[PDB]
Amino acid sequence: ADPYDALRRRWLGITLGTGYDPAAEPYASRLAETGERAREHRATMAPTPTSLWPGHPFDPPAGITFAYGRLWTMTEAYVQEGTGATGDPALLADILRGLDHLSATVYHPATTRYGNWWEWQIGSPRLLMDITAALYDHLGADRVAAACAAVDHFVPDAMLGAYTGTSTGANRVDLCRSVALRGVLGRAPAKIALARDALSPVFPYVTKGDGLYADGSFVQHTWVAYSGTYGQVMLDGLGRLFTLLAGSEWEVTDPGRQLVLDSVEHAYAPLIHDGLVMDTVNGRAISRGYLKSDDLHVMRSDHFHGQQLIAAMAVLAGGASNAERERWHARIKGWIERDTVTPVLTAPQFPVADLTRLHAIADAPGEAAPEPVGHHLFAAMDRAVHRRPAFTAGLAMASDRIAHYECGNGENPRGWHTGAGMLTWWANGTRADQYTDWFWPTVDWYRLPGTTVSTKRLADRAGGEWGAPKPDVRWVGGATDGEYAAVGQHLKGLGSTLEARKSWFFLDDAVVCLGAGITCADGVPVETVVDNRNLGEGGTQALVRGRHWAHLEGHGGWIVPGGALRTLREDRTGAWSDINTTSTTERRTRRWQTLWLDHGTDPAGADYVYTVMPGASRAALARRAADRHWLTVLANDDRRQAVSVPSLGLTAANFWQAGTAGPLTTTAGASVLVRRRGRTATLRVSEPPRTGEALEIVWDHPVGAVLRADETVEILATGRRLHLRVTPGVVCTTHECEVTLS
Ligand SMILES: CC(=O)N[C@@H]1[C@@H](O[C@@H]2OC(C(=O)O)=C[C@H](O)[C@H]2O)[C@@H](OS(=O)(=O)O)[C@@H](CO)O[C@H]1O
Ligand SMILES: [Mg+2]
């Protein structure tokens, strides 16, 4: 009996929290508030054949999970000290009433599942198990048995068989969560072992489909870049389950578990900036904001999502090694310090158990870590992240592997161009609320920052749901040394005949943006969005313009032909319900500064060059624009885009096909980055088309000897020039070669 009772107790410690004083803030106010929500939920519960709370019918099935969510708040009120309702028998009776009503009317084995599978197999059962676990002694054997039987009906063993469909990645972990608890609570050792075993296929790095990739990428729904939401769900359930089972007969022993720990710093941390997790990896969730069904009324946003991912790291850290835990805690202290948008330590979505874990990290000894300066190219999910002292940026692309966007369940119907070379960024050391402050419900979805698009009007959900629309292109990726990068996207526009070559060269204080082969036949204008910045409500940040630059006060600026540049400052009013059928309808106004180049109607091989300098002063921008020397554009056409930046000793080129640009030649499409440092140089090359066919590179610079080369890099000649052959692989890995110069 005791191994099950011990697991149940350990689950309650994880779920309800441990070793805090309920009288201390902020526990005291969160518990009081839970009491209050419980009291009102109790007062309004109204069992009917089709609902348990008015306005929340069992069809759609969200209305069932909705009901379990409220019974869970009631349960919390009942079992936690400090709530004003702890151990109140009348609260207890109403919980039991609601459970019995759900068990009688909807959540039971005579129901043939309808509507969203997720509500039945993930949303409701995890809550039902949690409630059952918290109230175990008061429930009696028939209720415990009937709760286990319902789980068995909606989540049978076969749901934890084939690693496919609705059972991969975050979904796999969520299914295991309910099956494990049903095993604990129903004293069914085989269900516990099943849930532990079924975690194994989540661990290994994949090269296609759902999961974690060796370059740190994370994919869910087969084609969607998703580290921020699904990746967090996976990380959260894994940490919960590792901690649950540790020390028991069903402890997770798969050594692949280490890959999940590794992913903290390698997959997730780079996407977190001052507490937010970047909207480029948040998929359809960027459209949620205030949800109609959320009794807490907490705005979803990049900051909400990052806070949830920080909380998952805090649970996971409990089972990490000392050295890992020490690094995670230091990064988390850093995020807690720098998040002035939504203070982590009092974040209103957090129950006391997360509050306690984060306060433990806060009070612990050690210094807060900064985000390391560097570049992270998440090539498997067509994402790049760049950090410099002056700014942080996240780029979103799309390819034959990665959808333009996801819409589904009423969410994100206008996200078409979020993958069309969207460049998002924050000025470092300023408030990081750019995309948080009612950005998505007010933005013009036809003018997303960095993108090139047809202005052709599109239908809500155009291209299809769940990541269905992908451009028919291969060359999307880049090459990086870990600090700077060349990134390129062969663009085909969504719902449009637009085609373009877009490149970005991520440097020490700027991103150089090249566009070429811009060709469309839609019969309407084509635009490249130099930027589009949310100014906040009533913003009065000055826009200053010069001959070849523009600067936005508080934000940064752009070097761009001043006569070609179009601008517009305007107020835009919108609501989350405009972009999500499940969100509130309250409307707010945000002022916008938008900047764009008009490529005319039906362009044929149109182009652009512009440089963004996030975080830069007006004067730094005026200097860089008047300086002819700092940057040479080697080539900007549909066969190759390439720059030379002598202050960095840097040459960078995206070769859309075999060709030459400045001192670089390639025999096949490739991305190449050369960096000279005194008497040595390192040459880096990737193959974004991912054919895996060998190609050669020549770099026209005298070279004495090779200090080192990856096993995939064969040296063909040195002397007057460097000549390499590279066997590139099919995941767009960057291969390197270091040489002595003559
Ligand atoms: C990852 C994701 O988008 N999942 C959808 C759910 O949202 C997650 O919900 C939960 C949870 O514990 O219920 C935790 C994650 O933070 C959320 O991102 C959810 O969608 S929604 O209602 O929040 O819009 C469900 C409910 O339908 O659908 C999932 O696909
Ligand atoms: Mg220079």
Short mmCIF file of N, CA and C in Angstrom, two decimals, residues 7 10 241-248 250-252:
data_model
loop_
_atom_site.label_atom_id
_atom_site.label_comp_id
_atom_site.label_asym_id
_atom_site.label_seq_id
_atom_site.Cartn_x
_atom_site.Cartn_y
_atom_site.Cartn_z
N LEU A 7 3.89 7.79 -3.44
CA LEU A 7 3.84 8.47 -4.74
C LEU A 7 2.74 9.56 -4.72
N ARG A 10 3.95 12.45 -2.73
CA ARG A 10 5.00 13.13 -3.45
C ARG A 10 4.34 14.00 -4.58
N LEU A 241 7.13 14.53 -13.81
CA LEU A 241 7.14 13.10 -13.73
C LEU A 241 8.46 12.56 -13.23
N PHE A 242 9.56 13.25 -13.58
CA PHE A 242 10.89 12.76 -13.14
C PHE A 242 10.93 12.86 -11.59
N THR A 243 10.46 14.00 -11.07
CA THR A 243 10.46 14.22 -9.67
C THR A 243 9.50 13.24 -9.02
N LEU A 244 8.34 12.99 -9.61
CA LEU A 244 7.34 12.10 -9.01
C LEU A 244 7.96 10.71 -8.76
N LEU A 245 8.49 10.11 -9.81
CA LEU A 245 8.93 8.72 -9.84
C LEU A 245 10.32 8.51 -9.26
N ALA A 246 11.08 9.58 -9.02
CA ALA A 246 12.45 9.39 -8.55
C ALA A 246 12.46 8.60 -7.23
N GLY A 247 13.30 7.58 -7.16
CA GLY A 247 13.39 6.84 -5.89
C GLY A 247 12.36 5.74 -5.80
N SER A 248 11.38 5.71 -6.69
CA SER A 248 10.43 4.62 -6.65
C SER A 248 10.78 3.48 -7.60
N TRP A 250 9.32 2.90 -10.23
CA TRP A 250 9.10 3.26 -11.64
C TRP A 250 9.89 4.49 -12.06
N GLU A 251 10.97 4.73 -11.33
CA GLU A 251 11.81 5.86 -11.57
C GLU A 251 12.21 5.79 -13.05
N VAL A 252 12.38 6.96 -13.67
CA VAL A 252 12.82 7.06 -15.07
C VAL A 252 14.32 6.92 -15.11
#
